[PDB]
């Protein structure tokens, strides 16, 4: 499985695609590594595991037009069977997602008083929005930091969003008329259940 | 100046021209940094730089032809006054060298035809105009590596002024000859 990772910081999350890859868990490779941000600490992660990097910045690109077209150039060079976001802070063009929707893949710190956990989604419109395959969700106890409940949430995104791509691994997921499709059933917006 | 520089290693050349340009002495910028080696050291000065990173890899193509098109795509997509070399080890194409033609610049180890030099690149036996040698003193005792220290150092110091004079618009090159100030420069560069 050709796994094309964007990412515009920690790379915490693209870590743990990367181990379940070396571990075999998802039977795929991540074959490059795309920031849009020239510091992010996850390139670094990448270059140790050596994984090839691009960089692209904005400022480098006189329309945000430019700025996808060449972007969507490297991408598809590694010729990507999903492209996960696994931390992109960038506002998507139809273009982008089109070219992508259907491998294209993101996850939230949040679901789609109050409760906490993550949800991981197909792309499929420029506002990030798409069918749920998996929601997760973090308790909070009675007195943790904001910090705790952080890492709380942090973890869950290691466990799940790794497996929500094994399923694309294998095959079991497909996103066709704008719904999420998990071994031939449907899935309800709340995801797999 | 907008500079792009190229490597596959450890990149203190790189560093220096990083620092060069944050202080001033060579007017211009590192745009973007490409390397061949994805565990390239370099690749992570660059990033506390906060210079963009790019890597291209051999396996990742099918052909030279391939890999050629795409790296001097990617590089000239940063418009490169100076595409710099330092230590790109790579067997460079025909096309890319007469692309970047005069003013791609690149460091050697010995003097031409121990020290450095700093010359342009081109399409010539010898191997293109040199710019500036610099050679390192050695004695015996020296061994291999000090006197491989010795010369590192003396990169440092060297590369950045020819960058920086580059970039300043003095250092020129034209009929396979390195001018400097309007004025031919000779064989062993500005001694």
Request: glycine share 8%; net charge negative.
């Amino acid at each position: 499985m050709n796994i094309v990772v964007l990412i515009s910081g920690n790379g915490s999350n693209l870590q743990a695609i990367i181990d379940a890859c070396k571990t075999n868990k998802i039977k795929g490779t991540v074959r490059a590594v795309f920031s849009n941000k020239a510091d992010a600490f996850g390139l670094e992660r990448a270059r140790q595991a050596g994984i090839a990097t691009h960089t692209l910045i904005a400022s480098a690109f006189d329309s945000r037009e430019a700025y996808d077209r060449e972007l969507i150039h490297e991408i598809d060079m590694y010729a990507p069977d999903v492209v996960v976001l696994a931390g992109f802070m960038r506002i998507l063009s139809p273009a982008f997602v089109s070219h992508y929707a259907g491998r294209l893949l993101n996850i939230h710190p949040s679901l789609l008083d109050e409760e906490h956990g993550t949800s991981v989604h197909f792309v499929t419109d420029e506002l990030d929005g798409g069918p749920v395959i998996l929601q997760a969700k973090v308790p909070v106890f009675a007195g943790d930091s904001e910090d705790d409940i952080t890492a709380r949430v942090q973890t869950q995104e290691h466990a799940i969003y790794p497996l929500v791509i094994s399923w694309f691994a294998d095959g079991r997921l497909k996103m066709h008329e704008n719904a999420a499709w998990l071994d031939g059933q449907r899935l309800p917006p709340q995801g797999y259940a």
